[PDB]
Amino acid sequence: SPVFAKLLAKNQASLCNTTLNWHSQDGAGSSYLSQGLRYEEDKKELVVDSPGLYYVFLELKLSPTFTNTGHKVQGWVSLVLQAKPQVDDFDNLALTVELFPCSMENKLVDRSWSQLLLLKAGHRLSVGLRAYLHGAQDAYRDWELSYPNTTSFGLFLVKPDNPWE
Amino acid sequence: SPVFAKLLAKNQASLCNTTLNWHSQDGAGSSYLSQGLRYEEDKKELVVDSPGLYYVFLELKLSPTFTNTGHKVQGWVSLVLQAKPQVDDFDNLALTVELFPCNKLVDRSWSQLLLLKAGHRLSVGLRAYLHGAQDAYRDWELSYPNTTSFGLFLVKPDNP
Ligand SMILES: *[C@@H]1O[C@H](CO)[C@@H](O[C@@H]2O[C@H](CO)[C@@H](O[C@@H]3O[C@H](CO)[C@@H](O)[C@H](O[C@H]4O[C@H](CO)[C@@H](O)[C@H](O)[C@@H]4O)[C@@H]3O)[C@H](O)[C@H]2NC(C)=O)[C@H](O)[C@H]1NC(C)=O
Ligand SMILES: *[C@@H]1O[C@H](CO)[C@@H](O[C@@H]2O[C@H](CO)[C@@H](O[C@@H]3O[C@H](CO)[C@@H](O)[C@H](O)[C@@H]3O)[C@H](O)[C@H]2NC(C)=O)[C@H](O)[C@H]1NC(C)=O
Numbered sequence: 001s002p003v004f005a006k007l008l009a010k011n012q013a014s015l016c017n018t019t020l021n022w023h024s025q026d027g028a029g030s031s032y033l034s035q036g037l038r039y040e041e042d043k044k045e046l047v048v049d050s051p052g053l054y055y056v057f058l059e060l061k062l063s064p065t066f067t068n069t070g071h072k073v074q075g076w077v078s079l080v081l082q083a084k085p086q087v088d089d090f091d092n093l094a095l096t097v098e099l100f101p102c103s104m105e106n107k108l109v110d111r112s113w114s115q116l117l118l119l120k121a122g123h124r125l126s127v128g129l130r131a132y133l134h135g136a137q138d139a140y141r142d143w144e145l146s147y148p149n150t151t152s153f154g155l156f157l158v159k160p161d162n163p164w165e
Numbered sequence: 166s167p168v169f170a171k172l173l174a175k176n177q178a179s180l181c182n183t184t185l186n187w188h189s190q191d192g193a194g195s196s197y198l199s200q201g202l203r204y205e206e207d208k209k210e211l212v213v214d215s216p217g218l219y220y221v222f223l224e225l226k227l228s229p230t231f232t233n234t235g236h237k238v239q240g241w242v243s244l245v246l247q248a249k250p251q252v253d254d255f256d257n258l259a260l261t262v263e264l265f266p267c268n269k270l271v272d273r274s275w276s277q278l279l280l281l282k283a284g285h286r287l288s289v290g291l292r293a294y295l296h297g298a299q300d301a302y303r304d305w306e307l308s309y310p311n312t313t314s315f316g317l318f319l320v321k322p323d324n325p
């Protein structure tokens with residue numbers, strides 16, 4: 001069976017610097033994870049069983065709130081992939097959205113990110129929400145992570161490890 | 166073995182409405198496709214062998230050119246996934262980048278989980294509407310090494 005996972009972010013009413021919580025199963029027992037992949041609620045980490053080349057993906061869906069007027073609050077919002085252990089290039093493994101007056105709107109922001117990464121057996125992956133917002137009083141209340149525009153995180157095994165290497 | 170492909174776009178010196186050409190192997194003879202996948206140069210299509218649920222992805226890398234200056238050129242650039250037969254999801258399977266009068270490399274990704282049939286053909290159309298300056302389409306390009314990509318992975322076979 002293909003090794004694949006697609007987790008959906010638990011709701012976040014406002015933005016802050018925190019590790020995101022994930023739904024690992026839908027409204028029924030059917031999990032968003034295949035075998036060879038586990039999700040740990042306590043650590044908020046996706047645990048990779050076998051080593052290989054994985055296609056890791058992040059999809060940020062920023063929903064504007066009632067207080068959002070679209071053209072005052074600026075800065076940036078990030079989804080930062082937190083890997084244990086660090087991968088050879090795990091330096092700024094992140095999906096960033098820049099908010100500037102130029103291109104700012106009172107509209108849903110839907111951005112995707114991907115990277116092919118060499119992961120080890122027992123590799124732990126968590127996702128941190130990062131944001132610096134300014135321009136109005138209570139700027140972090142102007143955006144949220146909510147269902148049905150759900151932020152997602154996942155991966156799939158592209159090439160299993162070759163031990164000889 | 167996993168069913169996976171990651172094709173890299175052939176160079177495009179300026180932006181226009183066309184079906185993109187793709188490299189199916191790198192500089193050496195190393196294939197960008199696994200077994201159960203083919204690329205047809207003539208049709209510019211990725212041919213899917215077995216039916217199932219595929220994670221299809223597009224990644225647009227727009228590189229600014231020498232003539233790319235100021236905050237005048239605006240509009241949009243798109244990568245349109247052209248399926249044969251039409252996938253009964255939406256007729257709007259596209260990556261779209263909006264350009265405002267704002268300049269560096271634009272790197273945007275798109276993905277969708279799609280139910281594909283045996284012999285499914287997938288091609289990618291480049292779409293663009295640029296205005297605000299005389300030869301606005303010359304201000305962006307698709308070039309190596311910041312190469313635009315297209316591929317997929319079989320997530321769930323129909324017949325294990
Ligand atoms: C690639 O395909 C896309 C379609 O997917 C295509 O984009 C379309 O381009 C036309 C023009 O080339 C756009 O139409 C414009 O709409 C605005 C709306 O306000 C008008 O102001 C424009 O008209 C001006 O020019 C006229 C002279 O002909 C004057 O009569 C008028 O007063 C205006 O000054 C113009 O009609 C159209 O909106 C887009 N479509 C989309 C969906 O954005 C694109 O041009 C194709 N690219 C290439 C490289 O040819
Ligand atoms: C979440 O973490 C980020 C860091 O990743 C925090 O962003 C940082 O926030 C401070 C203000 O709180 C920014 O400093 C400001 O700089 C400007 C420079 O002109 C100055 O005018 C201000 O007086 C202030 O010192 C800092 O730039 C920013 N860092 C980055 C990298 O953008 C953020 O505050 C944290 N968020 C929460 C919710 O606390």
Ligand code: NA
Pocket residue numbers: 061062063144145146147149150151
């Ligand atoms: Na959302």
Ligand code: NA
Pocket residue numbers: 184185186187209210287288289290
């Ligand atoms: Na094509």
Ligand code: NA
Pocket residue numbers: 226227228306307308309311312313
């Ligand atoms: Na490019």
